[PDB]
Design a protein around this ligand. Structure first.
Ligand SMILES: [Mg+2]
Ligand SMILES: [Mg+2]
Ligand SMILES: [Mg+2]
Ligand SMILES: [Mg+2]
Ligand SMILES: [Mg+2]
Ligand SMILES: [Mg+2]
Ligand SMILES: [Mg+2]
Ligand SMILES: [Mg+2]
Ligand SMILES: [Mg+2]
Ligand SMILES: [Mg+2]
Ligand SMILES: [Mg+2]
Ligand SMILES: [Mg+2]
Ligand SMILES: [Mg+2]
Ligand SMILES: [Mg+2]
Ligand SMILES: [Mg+2]
Ligand SMILES: [Mg+2]
Ligand SMILES: [Mg+2]
Ligand SMILES: [Mg+2]
Ligand SMILES: [Mg+2]
Ligand SMILES: [Mg+2]
Ligand SMILES: [Mg+2]
Ligand SMILES: [Mg+2]
Ligand SMILES: [Mg+2]
Ligand SMILES: [Mg+2]
Ligand SMILES: [Mg+2]
Ligand SMILES: [Mg+2]
Ligand SMILES: [Mg+2]
Ligand SMILES: [Mg+2]
Ligand SMILES: [Mg+2]
Ligand SMILES: [Mg+2]
Ligand SMILES: [Mg+2]
Ligand SMILES: [Mg+2]
Ligand SMILES: [Mg+2]
Ligand SMILES: [Mg+2]
Ligand SMILES: [Mg+2]
Ligand SMILES: [Mg+2]
Ligand SMILES: [Mg+2]
Ligand SMILES: [Mg+2]
Ligand SMILES: [Mg+2]
Ligand SMILES: [Mg+2]
Ligand SMILES: [Mg+2]
Ligand SMILES: [Mg+2]
Ligand SMILES: [Mg+2]
Ligand SMILES: [Mg+2]
Ligand SMILES: [Mg+2]
Ligand SMILES: [Mg+2]
Ligand SMILES: [Mg+2]
Ligand SMILES: [Mg+2]
Ligand SMILES: [Mg+2]
Ligand SMILES: [Mg+2]
Ligand SMILES: [Mg+2]
Ligand SMILES: [Mg+2]
Ligand SMILES: [Mg+2]
Ligand SMILES: [Mg+2]
Ligand SMILES: [Mg+2]
Ligand SMILES: [Mg+2]
Ligand SMILES: [Mg+2]
Ligand SMILES: [Mg+2]
Ligand SMILES: [Mg+2]
Ligand SMILES: [Mg+2]
Ligand SMILES: [Mg+2]
Ligand SMILES: [Mg+2]
Ligand SMILES: [Mg+2]
Ligand SMILES: [Mg+2]
Ligand SMILES: [Mg+2]
Ligand SMILES: [Mg+2]
Ligand SMILES: [Mg+2]
Ligand SMILES: [Mg+2]
Ligand SMILES: [Mg+2]
Ligand SMILES: [Mg+2]
Ligand SMILES: [Mg+2]
Ligand SMILES: [Mg+2]
Ligand SMILES: [Mg+2]
Ligand SMILES: [Mg+2]
Ligand SMILES: [Mg+2]
Ligand SMILES: [Mg+2]
Ligand SMILES: [Mg+2]
Ligand SMILES: [Mg+2]
Ligand SMILES: [Mg+2]
Ligand SMILES: [Mg+2]
Ligand SMILES: [Mg+2]
Ligand SMILES: [Mg+2]
Ligand SMILES: [Mg+2]
Ligand SMILES: [Mg+2]
Ligand SMILES: [Mg+2]
Ligand SMILES: [Mg+2]
Ligand SMILES: [Mg+2]
Ligand SMILES: [Mg+2]
Ligand SMILES: [Mg+2]
Ligand SMILES: [Mg+2]
Ligand SMILES: [Mg+2]
Ligand SMILES: [Mg+2]
Ligand SMILES: [Mg+2]
Ligand SMILES: [Mg+2]
Ligand SMILES: [Mg+2]
Ligand SMILES: [Mg+2]
Ligand SMILES: [Mg+2]
Ligand SMILES: [Mg+2]
Ligand SMILES: [Mg+2]
Ligand SMILES: [Mg+2]
Ligand SMILES: [Mg+2]
Ligand SMILES: [Mg+2]
Ligand SMILES: [Mg+2]
Ligand SMILES: [Mg+2]
Ligand SMILES: [Mg+2]
Ligand SMILES: [Mg+2]
Ligand SMILES: [Mg+2]
Ligand SMILES: [Mg+2]
Ligand SMILES: [Mg+2]
Ligand SMILES: [Mg+2]
Ligand SMILES: [Mg+2]
Ligand SMILES: [Mg+2]
Ligand SMILES: [Mg+2]
Ligand SMILES: [Mg+2]
Ligand SMILES: [Mg+2]
Ligand SMILES: [Mg+2]
Ligand SMILES: [Mg+2]
Ligand SMILES: [Mg+2]
Ligand SMILES: [Mg+2]
Ligand SMILES: [Mg+2]
Ligand SMILES: [Mg+2]
Ligand SMILES: [Mg+2]
Ligand SMILES: [Mg+2]
Ligand SMILES: [Mg+2]
Ligand SMILES: [Mg+2]
Ligand SMILES: [Mg+2]
Ligand SMILES: [Mg+2]
Ligand SMILES: [Mg+2]
Ligand SMILES: [Mg+2]
Ligand SMILES: [Mg+2]
Ligand SMILES: [Mg+2]
Ligand SMILES: [Mg+2]
Ligand SMILES: [Mg+2]
Ligand SMILES: [Mg+2]
Ligand SMILES: [Mg+2]
Ligand SMILES: [Mg+2]
Ligand SMILES: [Mg+2]
Ligand SMILES: [Mg+2]
Ligand SMILES: [Mg+2]
Ligand SMILES: [Mg+2]
Ligand SMILES: [Mg+2]
Ligand SMILES: [Mg+2]
Ligand SMILES: [Mg+2]
Ligand SMILES: [Mg+2]
Ligand SMILES: [Mg+2]
Ligand SMILES: [Mg+2]
Ligand SMILES: [Mg+2]
Ligand SMILES: [Mg+2]
Ligand SMILES: [Mg+2]
Ligand SMILES: [Mg+2]
Ligand SMILES: [Mg+2]
Ligand SMILES: [Mg+2]
Ligand SMILES: [Mg+2]
Ligand SMILES: [Mg+2]
Ligand SMILES: [Mg+2]
Ligand SMILES: [Mg+2]
Ligand SMILES: [Mg+2]
Ligand SMILES: [Mg+2]
Ligand SMILES: [Mg+2]
Ligand SMILES: [Mg+2]
Ligand SMILES: [Mg+2]
Ligand SMILES: [Mg+2]
Ligand SMILES: [Mg+2]
Ligand SMILES: [Mg+2]
Ligand SMILES: [Mg+2]
Ligand SMILES: [Mg+2]
Ligand SMILES: [Mg+2]
Ligand SMILES: [Mg+2]
Ligand SMILES: [Mg+2]
Ligand SMILES: [Mg+2]
Ligand SMILES: [Mg+2]
Ligand SMILES: [Mg+2]
Ligand SMILES: [Mg+2]
Ligand SMILES: [Mg+2]
Ligand SMILES: [Mg+2]
Ligand SMILES: [Mg+2]
Ligand SMILES: [Mg+2]
Ligand SMILES: [Mg+2]
Ligand SMILES: [Mg+2]
Ligand SMILES: [Mg+2]
Ligand SMILES: [Mg+2]
Ligand SMILES: [Mg+2]
Ligand SMILES: [Mg+2]
Ligand SMILES: [Mg+2]
Ligand SMILES: [Mg+2]
Ligand SMILES: [Mg+2]
Ligand SMILES: [Mg+2]
Ligand SMILES: [Mg+2]
Ligand SMILES: [Mg+2]
Ligand SMILES: [Mg+2]
Ligand SMILES: [Mg+2]
Ligand SMILES: [Mg+2]
Ligand SMILES: [Mg+2]
Ligand SMILES: [Mg+2]
Ligand SMILES: [Mg+2]
Ligand SMILES: [Mg+2]
Ligand SMILES: [Mg+2]
Ligand SMILES: [Mg+2]
Ligand SMILES: [Mg+2]
Ligand SMILES: [Mg+2]
Ligand SMILES: [Mg+2]
Ligand SMILES: [Mg+2]
Ligand SMILES: [Mg+2]
Ligand SMILES: [Mg+2]
Ligand SMILES: [Mg+2]
Ligand SMILES: [Mg+2]
Ligand SMILES: [Mg+2]
Ligand SMILES: [Mg+2]
Ligand SMILES: [Mg+2]
Ligand SMILES: [Mg+2]
Ligand SMILES: [Mg+2]
Ligand SMILES: [Mg+2]
Ligand SMILES: [Mg+2]
Ligand SMILES: [Mg+2]
Ligand SMILES: [Mg+2]
Ligand SMILES: [Mg+2]
Ligand SMILES: [Mg+2]
Ligand SMILES: [Mg+2]
Ligand SMILES: [Mg+2]
Ligand SMILES: [Mg+2]
Ligand SMILES: [Mg+2]
Ligand SMILES: [Mg+2]
Ligand SMILES: [Mg+2]
Ligand SMILES: [Mg+2]
Ligand SMILES: [Mg+2]
Ligand SMILES: [Mg+2]
Ligand SMILES: [Mg+2]
Ligand SMILES: [Mg+2]
Ligand SMILES: [Mg+2]
Ligand SMILES: [Mg+2]
Ligand SMILES: [Mg+2]
Ligand SMILES: [Mg+2]
Ligand SMILES: [Mg+2]
Ligand SMILES: [Mg+2]
Ligand SMILES: [Mg+2]
Ligand SMILES: [Mg+2]
Ligand SMILES: [Mg+2]
Ligand SMILES: [Mg+2]
Ligand SMILES: [Mg+2]
Ligand SMILES: [Mg+2]
Ligand SMILES: [Mg+2]
Ligand SMILES: [Mg+2]
Ligand SMILES: [Mg+2]
Ligand SMILES: [Mg+2]
Ligand SMILES: [Mg+2]
Ligand SMILES: [Mg+2]
Ligand SMILES: [Mg+2]
Ligand SMILES: [Mg+2]
Ligand SMILES: [Mg+2]
Ligand SMILES: [Mg+2]
Ligand SMILES: [Mg+2]
Ligand SMILES: [Mg+2]
Ligand SMILES: [Mg+2]
Ligand SMILES: [Mg+2]
Ligand SMILES: [Mg+2]
Ligand SMILES: [Mg+2]
Ligand SMILES: [Mg+2]
Ligand SMILES: [Mg+2]
Ligand SMILES: [Mg+2]
Ligand SMILES: [Mg+2]
Ligand SMILES: [Mg+2]
Ligand SMILES: [Mg+2]
Ligand SMILES: [Mg+2]
Ligand SMILES: [Mg+2]
Lengths: 48, 275
RNA sequence: CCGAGGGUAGGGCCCGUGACUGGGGCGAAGUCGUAACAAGGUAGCUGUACCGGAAGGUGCGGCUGGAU
RNA sequence: UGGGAGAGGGUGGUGGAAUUCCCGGAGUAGCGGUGAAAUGCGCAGAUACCGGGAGGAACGCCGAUGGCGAAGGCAGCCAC
RNA sequence: CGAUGUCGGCUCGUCGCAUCCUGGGGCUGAAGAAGGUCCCAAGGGUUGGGCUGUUCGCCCAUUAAAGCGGCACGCGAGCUG
RNA sequence: GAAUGCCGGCAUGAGUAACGAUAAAGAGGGUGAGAAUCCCUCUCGCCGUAAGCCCAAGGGUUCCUACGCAAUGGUCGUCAGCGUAGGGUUAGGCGGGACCUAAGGUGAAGCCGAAAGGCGUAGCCGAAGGGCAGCCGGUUAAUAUUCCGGCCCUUCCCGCAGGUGCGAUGGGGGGACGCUCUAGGCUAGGGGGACCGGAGCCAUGGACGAGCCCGGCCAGAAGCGCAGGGUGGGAGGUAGGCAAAUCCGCCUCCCAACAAGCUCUGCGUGGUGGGGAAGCCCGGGUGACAACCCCCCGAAGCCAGGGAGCCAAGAAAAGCCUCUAAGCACAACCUGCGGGAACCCGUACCGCAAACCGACACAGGUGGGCGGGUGCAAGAGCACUCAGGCGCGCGGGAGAACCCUCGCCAAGGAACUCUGCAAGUUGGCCCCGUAACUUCGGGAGAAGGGGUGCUCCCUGGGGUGAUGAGCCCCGGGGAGCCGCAGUGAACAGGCUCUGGCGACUGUUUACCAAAAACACAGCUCUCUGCGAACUCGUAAGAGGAGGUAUAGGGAGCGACGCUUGCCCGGUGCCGGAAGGUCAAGGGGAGGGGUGCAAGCCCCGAACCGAAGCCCCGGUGAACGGCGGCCGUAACUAUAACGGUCCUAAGGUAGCGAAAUUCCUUGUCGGGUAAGUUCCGACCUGCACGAAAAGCGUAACGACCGGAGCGCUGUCUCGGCGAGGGACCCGGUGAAAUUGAACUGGCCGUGAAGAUGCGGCCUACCCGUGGCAGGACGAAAAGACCCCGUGGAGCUUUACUGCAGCC
RNA sequence: GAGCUAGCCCUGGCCAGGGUGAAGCUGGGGUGAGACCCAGUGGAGGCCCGAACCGGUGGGGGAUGCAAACCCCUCGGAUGA
RNA sequence: UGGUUCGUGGAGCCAUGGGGGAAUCUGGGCGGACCACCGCCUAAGGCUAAGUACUCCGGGUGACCGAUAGCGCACCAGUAC
């Protein structure tokens, strides 16, 4: 049947993207966290 | 004269549509429409704030002239009488001798091809707009301003009327469609006659889908819900109310008055409503 | 081919009979009240409507076949 | 053809008496009701009296033993 | 109670005897036929239907008879629901 | 050494289940160390409104070629979506951007919030909507509307010529719109041809034929032709379109009107440029100088912004045109022509799937377009087939039980069972015919029956065309032939009677409930006069509503019909300018402390003092409630009648053993041979009852009862047969579970149900197919139940607070 | 976190074929004029049958599955909430 | 109302949301309600090293670990998944 993951590139980049993260106090903390932890990537990759 | 249908489907048994026989123009004036932005009952937080709304037919808003003291002394010809989905009354398209075109709510007995006018000099004839202090006592009137130059507020739904009762200083006394008696400032404008389409109250929707066409989604009963949702929720099997009948938010919904006591307009209400 | 009639299916009218139920008639001496006949003790009757254990009562309009 | 009397019918209007309610005044110990009462209403100010407002229904005197209509029936006044 | 699945039915048996039938008996208020009662006997047999989830029971038509109980109210790693 | 401990390793079950749709395979020839599995050929079968083709999303090299087989591939592998390496994606016209706006988002101005932040007009962003210039063929191993060939077109810059008051983010026109039905003429697509082109064919009894087989086009500028859309012309006045305005809007006059004219598309034709089958021969080449014509059917697409009807009344903005303002009229714009200029990103490949979503090469899920032919009344249905694409990545045998899916059955025909569950029956079309009842629509496909193929003969109307022939669509009548049987295969209702519930079509517990539940039109109560009530928010601000009592919120009832009684003492709500109580505050009788004293400081009676509460009334489609005992009639029985006790008042109408009745399978009647169910009745209603509505009701129902007919493998009662498994051989090879095991029966015993203790009996060692009585078999630290001063949801006249309101 | 699911908003798309035949219109009849009656045309509907599409009624299979909701037969809606 | 040991307590002190509201030394605050006496101090403006805290970093040292330990990572780890 229809499952939960229905990929969508615009949706991905607009929901979890860098620019979304920076427009919100909680989004900035995420990047501060993920940079402090040393994540290779700060945001989901979407091909665009 | 409301139209009936033969019982050739279960719903057509009671469905009754308006006769539309007084309309003379079947598409709106393009320079006077603008899109009506549908809300679905949602506010600017996006929250539902007025339940059970949405999914109605698409509409364009007709701009309606609720002032008319805009063009004191300038006569206008009644060009057409049109359908409006945003209100219960019909509307009348005026071609002013100005070359200017506007819409008013159509009063009863108005006719295409007639002249209307506005101002203190105007005749006391159906369709003319005057300051209340110049209309003779006893006159039936509609589209009444409530405060001077703020716009027509009262008696605008299909078939309603206000009746001038008497004068007192700068204030006339009105019997509103609700039966209440109120002082309204004499410099407020108003239009002679009652609103048209009086048969509007005898339309029988006949089926659920009709309500849906109007944007009215189905209204579910509190007694049908659960205690998380409503004071009447729950119970094993059906249940009486088991408490004073209440709204989803708890306040009592049988008799409990709710107009604000200290409201400053109280000094101008004379007699609360009837029936 | 028609055809007495047999068979299948569906209708119409009539007659008998039916748990129970509706009022009707009649029946020497039952119970409850007293509605009508006198102004019958609220004049009566009436068409309708509502009501009441029962006769009845009341509303609305009508009639004199109503009395002083 | 020329005349007439009429609450004959329909429609739109409209006048005054009276009752009830509301508002103000003024005024107090009861009012109402009946065969006699009581329920009811009234010092939270009623009844009686004055002024104002709203609303409905029926049209006093004329009026008669009268007029009109096929019958049921038709009564303020104006016009069609 | 870190689980012994809980009615009835179907299926499949199997055991007990306080025996319903069939076999053998004594007594009888046993003439005969037909019964009553008690004794011995478990080899075999012990029907089909209507009603109800029913067990049980009532009913219909038969029968030599239409027995009573146990096996975790026998049997859900066999079925049903 | 134990923690259902943690991490890791290795065992058991076991050579066991399984190897993923029952669409299906066989042979020959290659290749190679190795072949059921790779390549080639022939035969067979499967899809064909797809299982074929083209887009979009998503994926991200998986494409093409060479070279490989350790791992991946459920077997194999020489093969591959795998490994390595090289190659491959070409645009002014296609899509997106350098254009426009929609929801929404953001946001100069402004508003609000302890902070973070929330709003917010304009403006900006935002598309699969508006707008805008490319079609046919060829070519590569792999790209093509991109390269190439042919023929077309757009924008920007510049110059020339002619023309004109030029000039815009400003004014205006336009863009600009729904649903259902639909005309005219075309095209896409298809069918036929005795005509046109073609390599061949004559078989096996016949045919050298008006025979068989194959094909008979596609794109194209200007112009012309056909069919359509769009659109009045002139003048005078003008105060309206937030300046102006010759534009628009309004008024008047004349002229033009199903037209015409102008303009804009579609189709056709059109210089030219291409394509071109079977067959044969090795994707090529021939066929070929290929032919390229007539008739018909004909769209849901095109002309389009067409037409008509309807109510629920159907985006915006730019491009575009027109008007003027600053300006400027050496400019500028308009038109025609000419040259030059024309950027960024995507383009491979999969795309109903082995490449996307599901951990898998997973019987699941995934939006748009094309979807041929014949017959069956139609169609995207059904069967078979074209183009094309596949035979599902383990096989070979055997022919047990048993399981699945399927076929048939003597006689009986629901006797099965909780229940005809399931499976039969019926089954399309045309014709005849069709009941109660009904809201007059319906019930209705009621029920029940007849017809249905082929041949010859005669004839009626329609379309194209021409009125005719041909083609094609509907019929009518008559005579016959064949079989068991003619919707001969496939797809395609069983019916009726009678109850309960719900009016109805709808909605729901994604994944155990589809219902009588929710909703529903309609009915009633109640709030709300507009900065409305109400709702979300601290606020600003929003929804309500750009609505205004015929409207909007809240509540119950639930189409319609006939109806909806009595109680206001308690609780709620509504009204009550008196009286009672009531806090802060006012007031200051009178006390107190301290100081030498002025003073400073503290307590404090009466009295004035809000809402609330008390009190006085109203109110049921507000919360709710609607009696007990005793006696009485000339057979008896039973009480129309009375006595009395209590209540705020004692249940009316209608219904009643009921979706409600305990006793209960009440009693009687019906139906059956027999009826705890069903229907109809009675009424001592444990415990119906009138908008948590009462009683009925046509029609409707995958709802739930009862009966009948039809027909059946449901059953008496079982038999036989098919295929896919199970079984055997070759290949690959899991699982939960598992203290260890050398693991029998009985009668006892034991923590009370023993393979393991006692006594006795029985018993050589090890498997394989099967069956499920036991190992209190497996699975889940019982959901039931209790316990814990464990937890959470929910309620209220529990407690105590808070929002909110007064 | 609303790429599943629920509701709404904006903008697009989809619904083979067949059956029944409302209003209205025309004509006819009727009447003082009407209502109304017949025929024709017309093509309405939370109308009927049935694919696509959306569902998920009954039963059977599946139950360490093809699948952490599937498969077969059957069945509901299919111009509308 | 907050702070303080101070939870309304005899409740001062310090701070302040609201209301009322001075004086410039003979002015004003405090010494735990309040008054006297005796004393302490000068509110309603600002700045000010050092001694104090911490360890991304660098070094020194361990009756610290020694690859299931020591950081999650001795290794291409905030990776693969
Ligand atoms: Mg889903
Ligand atoms: Mg999706
Ligand atoms: Mg995307
Ligand atoms: Mg997208
Ligand atoms: Mg998106
Ligand atoms: Mg983003
Ligand atoms: Mg976001
Ligand atoms: Mg890096
Ligand atoms: Mg992130
Ligand atoms: Mg109707
Ligand atoms: Mg009717
Ligand atoms: Mg109208
Ligand atoms: Mg516009
Ligand atoms: Mg809005
Ligand atoms: Mg908003
Ligand atoms: Mg609301
Ligand atoms: Mg809403
Ligand atoms: Mg209207
Ligand atoms: Mg409205
Ligand atoms: Mg006013
Ligand atoms: Mg209404
Ligand atoms: Mg609407
Ligand atoms: Mg409603
Ligand atoms: Mg509801
Ligand atoms: Mg409920
Ligand atoms: Mg519920
Ligand atoms: Mg909740
Ligand atoms: Mg709660
Ligand atoms: Mg609650
Ligand atoms: Mg409740
Ligand atoms: Mg409930
Ligand atoms: Mg409930
Ligand atoms: Mg209950
Ligand atoms: Mg109730
Ligand atoms: Mg209750
Ligand atoms: Mg309440
Ligand atoms: Mg009022
Ligand atoms: Mg005969
Ligand atoms: Mg015979
Ligand atoms: Mg006696
Ligand atoms: Mg008498
Ligand atoms: Mg009398
Ligand atoms: Mg008397
Ligand atoms: Mg009475
Ligand atoms: Mg008194
Ligand atoms: Mg007094
Ligand atoms: Mg009144
Ligand atoms: Mg237990
Ligand atoms: Mg265990
Ligand atoms: Mg267990
Ligand atoms: Mg258990
Ligand atoms: Mg004898
Ligand atoms: Mg004996
Ligand atoms: Mg025996
Ligand atoms: Mg029984
Ligand atoms: Mg038992
Ligand atoms: Mg029993
Ligand atoms: Mg015998
Ligand atoms: Mg037994
Ligand atoms: Mg027992
Ligand atoms: Mg027991
Ligand atoms: Mg048992
Ligand atoms: Mg058992
Ligand atoms: Mg079981
Ligand atoms: Mg059992
Ligand atoms: Mg078991
Ligand atoms: Mg077993
Ligand atoms: Mg067991
Ligand atoms: Mg079950
Ligand atoms: Mg059950
Ligand atoms: Mg130990
Ligand atoms: Mg261990
Ligand atoms: Mg543990
Ligand atoms: Mg472990
Ligand atoms: Mg391990
Ligand atoms: Mg290891
Ligand atoms: Mg291992
Ligand atoms: Mg071992
Ligand atoms: Mg092994
Ligand atoms: Mg084994
Ligand atoms: Mg297995
Ligand atoms: Mg498997
Ligand atoms: Mg299959
Ligand atoms: Mg072969
Ligand atoms: Mg082979
Ligand atoms: Mg091979
Ligand atoms: Mg090999
Ligand atoms: Mg194969
Ligand atoms: Mg091959
Ligand atoms: Mg086909
Ligand atoms: Mg992938
Ligand atoms: Mg390999
Ligand atoms: Mg290999
Ligand atoms: Mg290698
Ligand atoms: Mg492998
Ligand atoms: Mg596999
Ligand atoms: Mg090789
Ligand atoms: Mg490539
Ligand atoms: Mg190009
Ligand atoms: Mg540029
Ligand atoms: Mg911040
Ligand atoms: Mg955006
Ligand atoms: Mg676009
Ligand atoms: Mg649009
Ligand atoms: Mg383009
Ligand atoms: Mg072109
Ligand atoms: Mg090449
Ligand atoms: Mg020009
Ligand atoms: Mg428009
Ligand atoms: Mg518009
Ligand atoms: Mg419509
Ligand atoms: Mg054809
Ligand atoms: Mg051409
Ligand atoms: Mg002007
Ligand atoms: Mg060729
Ligand atoms: Mg050649
Ligand atoms: Mg289409
Ligand atoms: Mg079009
Ligand atoms: Mg049109
Ligand atoms: Mg806009
Ligand atoms: Mg100038
Ligand atoms: Mg110049
Ligand atoms: Mg650029
Ligand atoms: Mg490409
Ligand atoms: Mg699929
Ligand atoms: Mg693939
Ligand atoms: Mg596979
Ligand atoms: Mg798949
Ligand atoms: Mg097609
Ligand atoms: Mg073809
Ligand atoms: Mg067919
Ligand atoms: Mg195969
Ligand atoms: Mg397949
Ligand atoms: Mg396979
Ligand atoms: Mg074998
Ligand atoms: Mg099969
Ligand atoms: Mg046979
Ligand atoms: Mg048979
Ligand atoms: Mg039978
Ligand atoms: Mg039979
Ligand atoms: Mg039966
Ligand atoms: Mg059942
Ligand atoms: Mg039954
Ligand atoms: Mg069939
Ligand atoms: Mg048939
Ligand atoms: Mg009948
Ligand atoms: Mg009938
Ligand atoms: Mg019937
Ligand atoms: Mg009926
Ligand atoms: Mg009928
Ligand atoms: Mg039939
Ligand atoms: Mg025939
Ligand atoms: Mg034949
Ligand atoms: Mg024959
Ligand atoms: Mg059918
Ligand atoms: Mg229901
Ligand atoms: Mg229903
Ligand atoms: Mg009902
Ligand atoms: Mg009903
Ligand atoms: Mg209903
Ligand atoms: Mg469910
Ligand atoms: Mg559930
Ligand atoms: Mg679930
Ligand atoms: Mg349910
Ligand atoms: Mg259903
Ligand atoms: Mg529900
Ligand atoms: Mg309903
Ligand atoms: Mg109703
Ligand atoms: Mg709130
Ligand atoms: Mg705040
Ligand atoms: Mg608004
Ligand atoms: Mg309901
Ligand atoms: Mg009726
Ligand atoms: Mg009460
Ligand atoms: Mg009360
Ligand atoms: Mg009271
Ligand atoms: Mg009150
Ligand atoms: Mg109660
Ligand atoms: Mg009570
Ligand atoms: Mg009554
Ligand atoms: Mg009863
Ligand atoms: Mg009974
Ligand atoms: Mg009942
Ligand atoms: Mg009951
Ligand atoms: Mg009972
Ligand atoms: Mg019982
Ligand atoms: Mg019985
Ligand atoms: Mg009987
Ligand atoms: Mg009784
Ligand atoms: Mg109830
Ligand atoms: Mg009914
Ligand atoms: Mg019915
Ligand atoms: Mg239904
Ligand atoms: Mg149903
Ligand atoms: Mg039956
Ligand atoms: Mg069988
Ligand atoms: Mg077989
Ligand atoms: Mg062997
Ligand atoms: Mg092997
Ligand atoms: Mg392997
Ligand atoms: Mg051991
Ligand atoms: Mg051992
Ligand atoms: Mg052993
Ligand atoms: Mg043994
Ligand atoms: Mg024991
Ligand atoms: Mg034992
Ligand atoms: Mg042993
Ligand atoms: Mg032992
Ligand atoms: Mg031992
Ligand atoms: Mg021992
Ligand atoms: Mg032993
Ligand atoms: Mg022993
Ligand atoms: Mg033994
Ligand atoms: Mg074996
Ligand atoms: Mg075995
Ligand atoms: Mg076993
Ligand atoms: Mg155990
Ligand atoms: Mg066991
Ligand atoms: Mg066991
Ligand atoms: Mg479990
Ligand atoms: Mg548990
Ligand atoms: Mg436990
Ligand atoms: Mg529980
Ligand atoms: Mg317990
Ligand atoms: Mg406790
Ligand atoms: Mg304790
Ligand atoms: Mg607790
Ligand atoms: Mg409130
Ligand atoms: Mg969504
Ligand atoms: Mg979604
Ligand atoms: Mg459809
Ligand atoms: Mg038909
Ligand atoms: Mg017709
Ligand atoms: Mg028509
Ligand atoms: Mg329908
Ligand atoms: Mg039909
Ligand atoms: Mg579904
Ligand atoms: Mg299913
Ligand atoms: Mg079935
Ligand atoms: Mg499952
Ligand atoms: Mg399936
Ligand atoms: Mg099926
Ligand atoms: Mg439907
Ligand atoms: Mg259907
Ligand atoms: Mg359809
Ligand atoms: Mg719709
Ligand atoms: Mg403190
Ligand atoms: Mg203190
Ligand atoms: Mg000084
Ligand atoms: Mg001093
Ligand atoms: Mg001082
Ligand atoms: Mg101080
Ligand atoms: Mg001090
Ligand atoms: Mg001191
Ligand atoms: Mg000091
Ligand atoms: Mg300062
Ligand atoms: Mg320092
Ligand atoms: Mg060490
Ligand atoms: Mg290690
Ligand atoms: Mg480590
Ligand atoms: Mg270590
Ligand atoms: Mg570190
Ligand atoms: Mg580690
Ligand atoms: Mg790594």
């Amino acid at each position: 049947m229809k499952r939960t993951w229905q990929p969508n590139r615009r949706k991905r980049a607009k929901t979890h993207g860098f620019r979304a993260r920076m427009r919100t106090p909680g989004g900035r903390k995420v990047l501060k966290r993920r940079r402090q932890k040393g994540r290779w990537r700060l945001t989901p990759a979407v091909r665009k | 004269a409301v139209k009936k249908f033969k019982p050739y489907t279960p719903s057509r048994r009671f469905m009754t549509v308006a006769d539309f026989s007084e309309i003379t123009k079947t598409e709106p004036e393009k320079s006077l429409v603008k899109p009506l932005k549908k809300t679905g009952g949602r506010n600017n937080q996006g929250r539902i704030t007025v339940r059970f709304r949405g999914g109605g037919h698409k509409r364009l808003y007709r701009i309606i002239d609720f002032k008319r003291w805009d063009k004191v002394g300038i006569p206008a010809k009644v060009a057409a009488i049109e359908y409006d989905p945003n209100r219960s009354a019909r509307i009348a398209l005026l071609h002013y001798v100005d070359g200017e075109k506007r819409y008013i709510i159509a009063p009863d007995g108005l006719q295409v091809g007639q002249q209307v006018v506005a101002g203190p000099d105007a005749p006391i004839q159906v369709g003319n707009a005057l300051p209340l202090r110049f209309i003779p006592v006893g006159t039936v009137v509609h589209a009444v301003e409530l405060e001077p130059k703020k716009g027509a507020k009262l008696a605008r739904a299909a078939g309603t009327s206000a009746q001038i009762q008497g004068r007192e200083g700068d204030y006339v006394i009105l019997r509103l469609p609700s039966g209440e008696l109120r002082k309204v400032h004499g410099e407020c404008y108003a239009t002679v006659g009652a609103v048209g389409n009086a048969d509007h109250k005898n339309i029988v929707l006949g089926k659920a889908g009709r309500s849906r066409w109007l944007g009215r989604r189905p209204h579910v009963r509190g007694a049908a819900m659960n205690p998380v949702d409503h004071p009447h929720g729950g119970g094993e099997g059906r249940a009486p109310r088991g408490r004073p009948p209440a709204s989803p938010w708890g306040w009592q919904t049988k008799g409990l008055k709710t107009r604000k006591r200290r409201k400053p307009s109280s000094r101008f209400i004379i007699a609360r409503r009837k029936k």
